[PDB]
Structures are given as C-alpha cells and as structure tokens.
Design a binder for this molecule. Structure first.
Ligand SMILES: *[C@@H]1O[C@H](CO)[C@@H](O[C@@H]2O[C@H](CO)[C@@H](O)[C@H](O)[C@H]2NC(C)=O)[C@H](O)[C@H]1NC(C)=O
Ligand SMILES: *[C@@H]1O[C@H](CO)[C@@H](O[C@@H]2O[C@H](CO)[C@@H](O)[C@H](O)[C@H]2NC(C)=O)[C@H](O)[C@H]1NC(C)=O
Ligand SMILES: *[C@@H]1O[C@H](CO)[C@@H](O[C@@H]2O[C@H](CO)[C@@H](O)[C@H](O)[C@H]2NC(C)=O)[C@H](O)[C@H]1NC(C)=O
Ligand SMILES: *[C@@H]1O[C@H](CO)[C@@H](O)[C@H](O)[C@H]1NC(C)=O
Ligand SMILES: *[C@@H]1O[C@H](CO)[C@@H](O)[C@H](O)[C@H]1NC(C)=O
Ligand SMILES: *[C@@H]1O[C@H](CO)[C@@H](O)[C@H](O)[C@H]1NC(C)=O
Ligand SMILES: *[C@@H]1O[C@H](CO)[C@@H](O)[C@H](O)[C@H]1NC(C)=O
Ligand SMILES: *[C@@H]1O[C@H](CO)[C@@H](O)[C@H](O)[C@H]1NC(C)=O
Ligand SMILES: *[C@@H]1O[C@H](CO)[C@@H](O)[C@H](O)[C@H]1NC(C)=O
Lengths: 195, 322, 183
C-alpha cells in the first residue's frame, strides 16, 4: 500500500516540494527586481551616462548601485536564515538515521507512531524518506486485577508482568500480548506480609 | 500592510512606493509564513492524540489528590486551579491603538480548546498511563501506573505498596507547596513574561519612529507637499520612504530570528510532552532533576508549563564492599 | 480642522477632565486622541476609522466560481460604513447586506452561512471556525471539532490487555539540503 499511497495523494512529497519552490521563487524575484527604478530615471545603466551631464549622473546612479546591493543583501540574509532551518533538519535526519536505522530506539514517538522495530532509508531529491516499521496492539479484553497475592502469610509480586483474572482463575501474563501462565515461584518473589 | 505604514491616506505617495517595485510583497509573504507557522506550533504539542478523552466523573485516584490539576466545574472558565493563577501572574491602548497599518490576528485555537486538549492529556495519563500514545488507550488503576514507573528506575515495586500512604502524603504536600512558590517568586513566569514584553517592546519601537525626521524637515507627509514645490518633495520624501522601509525591514528580520528560537523551543516541548508525559525517560536531567516518574502538562498564555515529578535519594550510610 | 489640527477620525464624547489651560491631547504612541473645541468647552474624542483587510475564501477554481469574503475586525452592525456601498457595485453589495451574516471575534464574514454540525477542519477561519465547500453550490462555515470522546471507564480493579497486534509502515519525509548557488 506504500507504493499506491505516494502515487495517489499528491501531498505525499509536499515537504520537499516547498524546498525547491522557495528557492525557485527566491531567484525569480531577485531577477525581476533589477527592472525597478528605485527613484532613478531608468533601470538601463547606459542611458544615464548618455543624457545626464556627468557629475549629476553619478548622483542618479547611486540609487541603482545601492538598490541592487540592498536586493542582494536581502536575498543573502534570507538564505542565511533558511540554511539554519535545514541544518536543524539535517541534524535531525543524521540523528534519526544513526538511531532509528542502526539500532532500536526507545524514545517514544521518534521512530514512528507506536513501538519501533526497524527503518529503511530511501533517497529523495534534496531530502530523505524513511519507512518506520512500527508495532500497534489491536483488540482489547477486560479482566479483573489485583496488585499482589499471598499464599502463606507473605505477599508475592510479579517478576515481570501483571496479575489478571477472568472470573475464577488468576493468571500472570505480559503487558502487550495476552498469554496466561500458571503461578509458580519463577514468576513470584516474596516481600513482607499480606496485612 | 506596507502601503499604509509607509504612506498615509495619500494617493500620490502610493505611486512613489510603487516605483520602488515589489518590495512590499516580500514583507507580507514573510509575515504570513510566521503567522501560519504559529498556528502550526500549537498542533505539534497539545494535539498528540485525537480522541478527546473524557475526565472520570469519580475522584479518589488510588489515594492521591489531583484536585489542584484536574478541571473544576464550579469555575465559570473551564480551567483547573493551578492554571487559574497562571492566567493572572502573566500580564498582556494595550491592543486597540496599534491600528496604524498593523494588526494582531486572533489565534486559530482559542483558550478553551487548548484547555480541553490539556484536560484530555490529563484524563488519559491517569487511567491509562503511557499506552494511550501508541494505539488503543487501555485502562489500569493509578496505584499501579506508579508501581510500573518505579520499575524503570531500578528501585522495584516493594517500595510503593509497602509504605503507600506516605508517598501519597509526600505527593499531596508537594503539590500543595507548588501553589505558594509560584505566587511569591518574582520571576516564576519569567520566561513567558518577557516573551509578551518583547513583542510589546518591538511594536512600540516600530510605531514610535513614525514621528521622526530621518534627515527630512518634518515627519508629516501631506503638509510638506504643500509647503514645497514638486521637485524638492521627491528629493526629500525618498528619505522618509527609505527611512521607514529600512525601519520595517528591521522589524521583520528580527521576527524571523525570534521565530527561529520559539520553533527551537516548540520542538523541545513537543519532545517533552511525548517522552516525559507519554512515557518515562532515562535521559539524565531531561525530565526533571533526578530519576523521573511522570509529568503533568499545564497551559499558559503563549506558552506551556510542565509539572515534573522526580525521585531523589536522601539519608545515606557507610558500608564495606567487595 | 478645528483647533488647528488636520486629520481624520470620529468626533465623540468621553469622560475626561481637561486642565483649564490644556488644549491638545496625546497618547503613549504620540497621536492625537482628545481635542477641546474652541467655540464650546467640553471633552471630545477621536477614534480611528475602518482599517483591517479582506480575505477571499475560495474553494478550488475547478469546482466553483462564487466566493465568500471575510472582514477582519469589523462589527456587523456597522459594515456599510466600512463597506461604503455607494461606490460599490450591487454585485459587490451582495456581501454588504443580506440574510447571510455572521459575527465572531475574528471578524464578520459574509457570503457563507453558519451550520450547527461539527466535523473535521478544511479551511481555517479564525478563533475556532473552519469553512468547507458542501453541496448545493454554497460555502458553509461550521465549528471546528477536535475528535470523538472515548470516555474510558476507570476502575480500581479493571485492566485491559491486548490479544492481537498489527504491523504498520509509516512514512516520514525530511529535507537534507537545499540547492547550492553563487553570485
Ligand atoms: C477463565 O480461563 C480459564 C483458562 O482459560 C478457564 O479454565 C478452563 O475452563 C475450561 C472450560 O470451562 C476447562 O475445560 C479447563 O479445565 C479450565 N482450566 C483450568 C486450568 O481449570 C475458565 O473456564 C475461564 N473462566 C470463564 C468464566 O470463562
Ligand atoms: C484535595 O485537595 C483539596 C485542596 O486542599 C482539598 O480541598 C480542601 O478540603 C478541606 C476539607 O475537606 C477544606 O477545608 C479546604 O478548604 C479545601 N480546599 C479548597 C481549596 O477548597 C480536598 O479535600 C483534597 N481531597 C483529598 C481526597 O485529599
Ligand atoms: C490477529 O489479527 C489478524 C489480522 O490483523 C488475523 O488475521 C486474519 O485472520 C482471519 C481469520 O483467521 C483471516 O480471514 C484474515 O485474512 C487474516 N488477515 C490477515 C491480514 O492475514 C489473525 O487471525 C488474528 N489472530 C487471532 C489469534 O485473533
Ligand atoms: C469492557 O471493555 C470496554 C472497552 O472496549 C469498556 O467500554 C467496557 O466498559 C468494559 N466492561 C467491563 C465490564 O469492564
Ligand atoms: C562515611 O565515610 C567516612 C568513613 O571513613 C566518614 O567520613 C563517615 O563515616 C562517612 N562520611 C559521610 C557520611 O560523609
Ligand atoms: C481541478 O479539477 C480536478 C478535477 O476534479 C480536481 O482535482 C480539482 O477540482 C482541481 N485540482 C486541484 C489540484 O484543485
Ligand atoms: C458588535 O456590536 C454589537 C452591538 O452593536 C455587540 O453586541 C458585539 O459584542 C460586537 N462584537 C464584538 C465586540 O466583537
Ligand atoms: C443553530 O445555530 C444557531 C447559532 O447559534 C443557534 O441559535 C441555533 O439554536 C442552532 N440550532 C439548533 C437546532 O441547535
Ligand atoms: C475502589 O477500590 C477499592 C479497594 O478495595 C474497592 O473496594 C472498590 O470496590 C473500588 N471501587 C469500585 C467502584 O470498584
């Protein structure tokens, strides 16, 4: 269903789509800005040196030199900020691919929603796509529980598990999969008295 | 709005700004990008779950007291008691006279639905534990979600059942003390008071520069057009145009730098409400100082307040080891 | 222009007490807000006029051509002052007077009708309202919902344990690098 889902919803690869759209728009606005006047006569540098007397012309072209310099300064400043939010995500990808892929992570809701099993990096244009294989419980059943149990005056506690019952028998099982077992000493360790 | 800030209700000043060309569009497009992202920042933190879990109608959660944190129906604003102070210590004419081109857009999420998400996180972390953030939300008492949270420390479960009531009383007294300590301390909400102060400081400096000469003769626009013949006006109102446009670029550029550290702190709160709250973390000095037990999220104006619970060993002895 | 002050606004009254020599009035932001009338001695006031912007609420252009509009920070009881319908076409005056009028803290949108049902959000509006295109051939503005209520039955001896699992594959996407450039 993964192949069908990316080829269906057209917002599957939106994140990386805005990355190339912002840079295409940034260069396009920069090119169109040199047609402006900035209070001068025209955007063509040749005509000012032709009609204007030379010392006054130098005044009118000071608008165009600092007008385009302000346009490059504004453009460069946006790339400086925009490179910071990519390096904040490049370091997040270098952290995910060094923990989610090359090991099993226990940080909740970091490698996929649920309990994490594996990962699979794939190369995408100006980015990376992960495939977080996860684990999700399905169907729940009600049970009656007790925090401990005592046989001969001394309480017993689960070694690793929860005591459950279904009405007439008490069982110890795991915490994420139903599998009852019989209460022995291998499941119980004693502590104190049951009063 | 660029047009109204730089020029007033002047028709000929609108054409002078048009001669500069396409400068104002970048300013609005940048500012929306922040304004859309601010509504995005709230969704990654408070909206970790979709099913809004109803609060239990019955109290006595195993022996503890959650009255201070769980919402009280007797209040006319449906909030909790500790959250009640937090809306009074933080302060925010104040928002009416700024209409000179600027505006303060209302947030998409109001203070009620944010108070419901927090009341949904709180109602699931009590009766289900960490499960409700990984699939169907199961159900288990609270004198047990505590004994399966001493098991991650290494202190095992014999410490909780036995001597149960003192841990109930220690938690009850600890939550009683946190109400008084927030009231008196001057900087208790220091990190949120200066956030709303800095935006107030930023807008006030931006609006106070509308009455500055910037090298011209006066800061009035329509009057200096009538005291002067047309060539001089152009040869002077460029200074006011390039003065305010540079003064508005400074305001915008500060906001992108400022929004780059709230997003650095929203992601720190999105990874603290998903590891401390929806589980138990073993990152040292991350979810409170000492060994971690759980957390309780609480809301605040333009912020969030986490209420960690920790475990700290105390009286110690000397022994001989091999 | 009275008392030697050029500007625009609304002249109303307020509860102030001028000094016997004080003439003008100014605020923190250094603007005129209280001017004393030369001919008659009382307390006046000056408030700003109109302001705010508009937002064209539209669905996809392949599905509709008629659109809504949103008036930010304008009370519905005084829209035609801030609409100025004398200079506007009756096509534009559909969004000036009519049955479909709605008020909220975000603004006073018009061209869309409120509906009482609540479901998922499509287009955000402001202060807890979402708009969607539901047919026929009209735009509605409902109240945004947050989801359903599970209402877990808490009890002192009730435990739920799953008996089956599912394995899912979740795809997440991250940028790594933007395009290099030089000038
Ligand atoms: C609770 O579960 C236990 C174990 O699954 C059930 O005990 C078994 O019941 C069957 C049918 O009644 C018997 O044939 C077995 O001999 C029982 N096992 C033991 C160890 O006695 C029990 O019936 C279930 N209780 C209810 C109310 O369904
Ligand atoms: C939980 O704490 C609240 C807050 O102290 C308790 O409410 C107090 O109850 C006592 C007597 O029951 C009153 O004298 C106080 O005035 C109450 N405080 C407030 C702020 O109204 C509540 O009783 C506690 N509940 C449990 C189960 O411990
Ligand atoms: C656990 O759940 C899976 C599905 O999540 C069950 O697999 C289905 O089993 C039925 C009947 O056994 C089949 O008709 C379906 O085709 C199976 N689905 C798939 C995807 O294989 C499985 O049987 C369940 N196990 C238990 C013990 O309840
Ligand atoms: C059984 O579990 C369901 C959860 O699916 C719950 O709604 C119901 O109240 C439970 N009944 C009992 C008797 O525990
Ligand atoms: C443990 O260490 C030494 C024992 O030689 C002594 O100072 C004292 O008994 C203890 N010190 C403490 C508790 O600081
Ligand atoms: C254009 O029309 C198609 C055909 O139904 C539909 O996807 C939609 O209305 C329009 N496309 C987009 C991307 O909005
Ligand atoms: C709009 O005005 C009406 C009365 O004219 C008032 O009741 C309502 O509260 C106002 N809307 C606001 C202040 O958002
Ligand atoms: C529909 O919404 C309006 C707006 O608040 C409300 O007055 C009316 O009572 C609602 N209708 C029903 C049937 O609830
Ligand atoms: C709450 O726990 C006590 C502890 O024994 C139990 O007696 C009581 O029945 C429980 N309440 C309910 C409603 O089951």
């Amino acid at each position: 269903k993964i192949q069908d889902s990316l080829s269906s919803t057209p917002s599957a690869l939106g994140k990386l789509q805005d990355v190339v759209n912002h840079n295409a728009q940034a260069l396009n606005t920069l090119v169109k800005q040199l047609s402006s006047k900035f209070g001068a006569i025209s955007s063509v540098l040749n005509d000012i040196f032709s009609r204007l007397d030379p010392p006054e012309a130098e005044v009118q072209i000071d608008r165009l030199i600092t007008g385009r310099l302000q346009s490059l300064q504004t453009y460069v400043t946006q790339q400086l900020i925009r490179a910071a939010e990519i390096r904040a995500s490049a370091n997040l990808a270098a952290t995910k691919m060094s923990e989610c892929v090359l090991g099993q992570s226990k940080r909740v809701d970091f490698c996929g929603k649920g309990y994490h099993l594996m990962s699979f990096p794939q190369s995408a244009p100006h980015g990376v796509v992960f495939l977080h294989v996860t684990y999700v419980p399905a169907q729940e059943k009600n049970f009656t529980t007790a925090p401990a149990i005592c046989h001969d005056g001394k309480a017993h506690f689960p070694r690793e598990g929860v005591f459950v019952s279904n009405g007439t028998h008490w069982f110890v099982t795991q915490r994420n999969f139903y599998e009852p077992q019989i209460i022995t000493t291998d499941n119980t360790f004693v502590s104190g008295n049951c009063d | 709005d660029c047009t109204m800030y730089i020029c007033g209700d002047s028709t000929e000043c609108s054409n002078l700004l048009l001669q500069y060309g396409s400068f104002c569009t970048q300013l609005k497009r940048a500012l929306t990008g922040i304004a859309v992202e601010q509504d995005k920042n709230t969704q990654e933190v408070f909206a970790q779950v979709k099913q809004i879990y109803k609060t239990p109608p019955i109290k006595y959660f195993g022996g503890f007291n959650f009255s201070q944190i769980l919402p009280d129906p007797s209040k006319p604003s449906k909030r909790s008691p500790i959250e009640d102070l937090l809306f009074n210590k933080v302060t925010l004419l104040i928002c009416a006279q700024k209409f000179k081109g600027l505006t303060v857009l209302p947030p998409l999420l109001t203070d009620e639905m944010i108070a419901q998400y927090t009341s949904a996180l709180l109602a699931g972390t009590i009766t289900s534990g960490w499960t409700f953030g990984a699939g169907p939300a199961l159900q288990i008492p609270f004198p047990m979600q505590m004994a399966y949270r001493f098991n991650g420390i290494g202190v095992t479960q014999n410490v909780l059942y036995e001597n149960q009531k003192l841990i109930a009383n220690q938690f009850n007294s600890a939550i009683g003390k946190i109400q008084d300590s927030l009231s008196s301390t001057p900087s208790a909400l220091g990190k949120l008071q200066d956030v709303v102060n800095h935006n107030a400081q930023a807008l006030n400096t931006l609006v106070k520069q509308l009455s500055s000469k910037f090298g011209a003769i006066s800061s009035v626009l329509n009057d200096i057009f009538s005291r002067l013949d047309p060539p001089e006006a152009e040869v002077q109102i460029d200074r006011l145009i390039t003065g305010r446009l540079q003064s508005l670029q400074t305001y915008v550029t500060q906001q992108l730098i400022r929004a780059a550290e709230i997003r650095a702190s929203a992601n720190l709160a999105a990874t603290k409400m998903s590891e401390c709250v929806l589980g138990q973390s073993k990152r040292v000095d991350f979810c409170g100082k000492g060994y971690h037990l759980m957390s309780f999220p609480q809301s605040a104006p333009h912020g969030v307040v986490f209420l960690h619970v920790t475990y700290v060993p105390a009286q110690e002895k000397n022994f001989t080891t091999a | 222009n009275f008392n030697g002050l050029k500007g625009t606004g609304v002249l109303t009254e307020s509860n102030k007490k001028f000094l016997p020599f004080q003439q003008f009035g100014r605020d923190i932001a250094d603007t005129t807000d209280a001017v004393r009338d030369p001919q008659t001695l009382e307390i006046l006031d000056i408030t700003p006029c109109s302001f705010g912007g508009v937002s064209v609420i539209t669905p996809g252009t392949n599905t509709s051509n008629q659109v809504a509009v949103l008036y930010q920070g304008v009370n519905c009881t005084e829209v035609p002052v801030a609409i100025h319908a004398d200079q506007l076409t009756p096509t534009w005056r559909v969004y000036s007077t009519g049955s479909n009028v709605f008020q909220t803290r975000a603004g006073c949108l018009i061209g869309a009708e409120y509906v009482n049902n609540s479901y998922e959000c499509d287009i955000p509006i402001g202060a807890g309202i979402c708009a969607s295109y539901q047919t026929s051939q009209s735009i509605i503005a409902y109240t945004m919902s947050l989801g359903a209520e599970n209402s877990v039955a808490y009890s002192n001896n009730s435990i739920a344990i799953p008996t089956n699992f599912t394995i899912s594959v979740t795809t997440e996407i991250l940028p790594v690098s933007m395009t290099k450039t030089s000038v």
